[PDB]
């Protein structure tokens, strides 16, 4: 139970040839790089090369056999350690110190953390003059990104086909695609090493350098990040693609949905958050039927899952948890209104309920789809807003059950004002608050949006499904103040809402 490291490797390559007699060998990679660095040596002390490519294996290009591995490790690990002891130098386990390498109880915990490109980190790479254009006057994407060309029989820079490495490089090597693991370590590190030789600004090479939280906290962050130009649409028409050999059950039920891609791109931290496997349509996997590709997660799940950041409702659902929205949204139950489904589910202008059943939207070119979506977006209703506050009692006197205390002097319009203020400019609120009275329903729930809401006592206090009057006031009042972090009147200060008799 020692210090947390990010450089731990469990050496157990021999286990694929059969059962190990001894524990796997814990190796601290960074502790070794710095020792070897200070010996005046480098990577080539432990990693061989082939055609320029450095091997990530220790002193070999292949694992040829169990006996060859053990020879390679014993000769080379111990050889160095032996030499260093011969000079009076800080060294590692010797010859006869079996258990010190084959250690069932290494005293070192893991601080290892995964690493990924931010909006910012991606741009630091794109904007780097040390990463020179390839296959274009300007663009340096081809220095890092590729696609297999079928016709080439080669990797090529596929213009506008860039994706996260995670799209193609997964947990294990599939076919000729190395694992994420291997791809990263091959591509990232070796470029960093190439650039460090030019003495320009570069990326990390030590394990901690990429994988330690403290190291990651230190990465220079750029905030002025332009749009990533991959030829993404500005507006998308998302369609109920039924699926190949999907039955009639699986045809489109709801109106289609124009999606503001441009807007959402600037509000997200990357593309991955949504395109979690692949940059493509969602419907390439999430048909209305569901595909193997998607583990049979259906279209509706992909778009409405209340607790996924991936889905429209799910991601929007974590937005309404911010203290600013939570006062109302921690209280109200969703209507699941036809009207509310209609915020996203919109009629497509040119083609009407007869060209649709037969595929008129489903066989549009992507450009055509952008126009039809562009058209839906710029034709949605204008953000309705609320009533004029002066049509609202400035102060309300909650007294109907006054007994142990005086009637409450509840600053109605003040509070409404502040709520609107706290929201201000938020595009979800502005769009999805579809009525002039929607905001009112934040407290005036289970009732049509209007200027003249019924009293609470028209439903509370007199079937045990709802609180009595006292409880309903206390729960609504105190609950919002909790959710919004309003210390203003404390829940504990009985007099601050209603004075003593
Ligand atoms: C570190 C410097 C080591 C010392 C000291 C000793 N061994 Fe080792 N050994 C080392 C490595 C990195 C490996 C590869 C491990 C793997 O699982 O891939 C090995 C391998 C062995 C094996 C074969 C694997 C197994 O059956 O567990 C054996 C049997 C083995 N080593 C024995 C052994 C003995 C008896 C040692 C003391 C004399 C000894 N090793 C020292 C690294 C190191
Ligand atoms: C000997 C003391 C080493 C030196 C010098 C360097 N590395 Fe190394 N590396 C070493 C071992 C024993 C292993 C495990 C693989 C095995 O065959 O036993 C590695 C592995 C790596 C990896 C993969 C890490 C992982 O997925 O766990 C990388 C990315 C790597 N090595 C890079 C690397 C670089 C860039 C070095 C020079 C600066 C370097 N290594 C030196 C042992 C040794
Ligand atoms: C020189 C080129 C080395 C090679 C090759 C390997 N090791 Fe090493 N090792 C080296 C040094 C200078 C040290 C001491 C580092 C320090 O700062 O004190 C070590 C130490 C170890 C240890 C002990 C780590 C600890 O907890 O204190 C282990 C378990 C170890 N070395 C294992 C190891 C293995 C398995 C190697 C081959 C894959 C190997 N070392 C190579 C120097 C060198
Ligand atoms: C940044 C340039 C890195 C350096 C330096 C090293 N690694 Fe790494 N590692 C890096 C990436 C981009 C990935 C893919 C997953 C991710 O975090 O984005 C990895 C992966 C690993 C793993 C993955 C194991 C798994 O369960 O998926 C391990 C165990 C690992 N890396 C170890 C490791 C070591 C020991 C390194 C120094 C020799 C090292 N990494 C360098 C990025 C970078
Ligand atoms: C190497 C230095 C790169 C250059 C030059 C460019 N990109 Fe890149 N990109 C790179 C990596 C290592 C990743 C993986 C990010 C991760 O953490 O998984 C990416 C990712 C992308 C993506 C997917 C976005 C996402 O959400 O991860 C896209 C669409 C992308 N890259 C496009 C792109 C373009 C258009 C570039 C040229 C201007 C470009 N990249 C450069 C590495 C590198
Ligand atoms: C899918 C379209 C891919 C994405 C996204 C990335 N890579 Fe890839 N890579 C892909 C294929 C089909 C192959 C195998 C090519 C073949 O020989 O048939 C590869 C290969 C690599 C390798 C192998 C070593 C090499 O010579 O380049 C590496 C190191 C590699 N890929 C790295 C890599 C990185 C770092 C990526 C993110 C920016 C990445 N690939 C994305 C397909 C795809
Ligand atoms: C060469 C084409 C590279 C590849 C492939 C990857 N990176 Fe890189 N990286 C490269 C350069 C030229 C720079 C300097 C950028 C600048 O600020 O001018 C960097 C920087 C980083 C950093 C930031 C380090 C810091 O500020 O301390 C990180 C974390 C980093 N690089 C990591 C990284 C990873 C994980 C990569 C593969 C997925 C990767 N880089 C690819 C050059 C190149
Ligand atoms: C945006 C935030 C949405 C709201 C609010 C609702 N839906 Fe949705 N839905 C959305 C998208 C982007 C999609 C994929 C495109 C498409 O039009 O299919 C969907 C899809 C569905 C589906 C599956 C397809 C179909 O059967 O036609 C259903 C059944 C569906 N939507 C129903 C639905 C209902 C009942 C809603 C109100 C409660 C509702 N959606 C709201 C995005 C959004
Ligand atoms: C979630 C908020 C997203 C972010 C961030 C990004 N994209 Fe996206 N994208 C998203 C959806 C819901 C759709 C429509 C999907 C459908 O099934 O029609 C898209 C669409 C695209 C496309 C077009 C795919 C096609 O029609 O063939 C591309 C090329 C695309 N998205 C790329 C992309 C990039 C590069 C992003 C980050 C820079 C990015 N998207 C962000 C959801 C989200
Ligand atoms: C096929 C390659 C896919 C594409 C294209 C998209 N997603 Fe996906 N989806 C896919 C898989 C393999 C899974 C299950 C395993 C997993 O990745 O978690 C899913 C599941 C979802 C879910 C389920 C909710 C959850 O548990 O996270 C959602 C909300 C989802 N997918 C959303 C989504 C969106 C909006 C996409 C377009 C940008 C999208 N996925 C693309 C496979 C695939
Ligand atoms: C009380 C005064 C509210 C505040 C503050 C915010 N919202 Fe709200 N919102 C309120 C009501 C009474 C309703 C109707 C609920 C229904 O299901 O019909 C809404 C509706 C929304 C919705 C649509 C449905 C849903 O996802 O719950 C969204 C997306 C929404 N509101 C977003 C939102 C955000 C982001 C807010 C913070 C800035 C916010 N609202 C404040 C009442 C109130
Ligand atoms: C919670 C923070 C509220 C918001 C937002 C709005 N109102 Fe309200 N209002 C609220 C309470 C707790 C009460 C007292 C009702 C009771 O039964 O004791 C009221 C009162 C009114 C009234 C007068 C009630 C009556 O006696 O008829 C009206 C006309 C009224 N509220 C309207 C109204 C409108 C139009 C709102 C949206 C702008 C609105 N209120 C917001 C709590 C909250
Ligand atoms: C009838 C039309 C009602 C009016 C006017 C008000 N409430 Fe209500 N309330 C009503 C029902 C049917 C329910 C249960 C179902 C639901 O939609 O929540 C409630 C619930 C509450 C609760 C508890 C919510 C919980 O999560 O447990 C509270 C605290 C509450 N109501 C308070 C309240 C207040 C202060 C009102 C005046 C503005 C009010 N309700 C009006 C029915 C009706
Ligand atoms: C504002 C956020 C409040 C705080 C803090 C407390 N209560 Fe309250 N309570 C509140 C309202 C709006 C009402 C309805 C008042 C009315 O006369 O219509 C109440 C009601 C009561 C009642 C019943 C009415 C009465 O007996 O006068 C009791 C007994 C009561 N409240 C007790 C009470 C105590 C002990 C509190 C502090 C611990 C307390 N309330 C805080 C709103 C708010």
From Swiss-Prot:
Residues binding heme c 2, per UniProt: 32, 77, 80-81
Gene name per UniProt: hmcA
Binding annotation for heme c 11: 325, 328-329, 433
Binding site for heme c 13: 412, 440, 443-444
SUPFAM superfamilies: Multiheme cytochromes (SSF48695)
Record: residues binding heme c 12: 304, 341, 344-345
Binding site for heme c 3: 74, 98, 101-102
Function: HMWC (high-molecular-weight cytochrome c), ORF2, ORF3, ORF4, ORF5 and ORF6 in the HMC operon form a transmembrane protein complex that allows electron flow from the periplasmic hydrogenase to the cytoplasmic enzymes that catalyze reduction of sulfates.
GO cellular component: periplasmic space
Post-translational modification note: Binds 16 heme c groups per subunit. High-spin heme 15 has single axial histidine ligand and the other hemes are low-spin bis-histidinyl coordinated.
Keyword Kinase on entry: no
Sequence positions that bind heme c 5: 146, 165, 168-169
Record key words, sorted: Electron transport, Heme, Iron, Metal-binding, Periplasm, Repeat, Signal, Transport
One Pfam match: Cytochrom_CIII
Protein name in the entry: High-molecular-weight cytochrome c
Binding-site residues, heme c 15: 477, 480-481
Binding site for heme c 16: 474, 494, 497-498
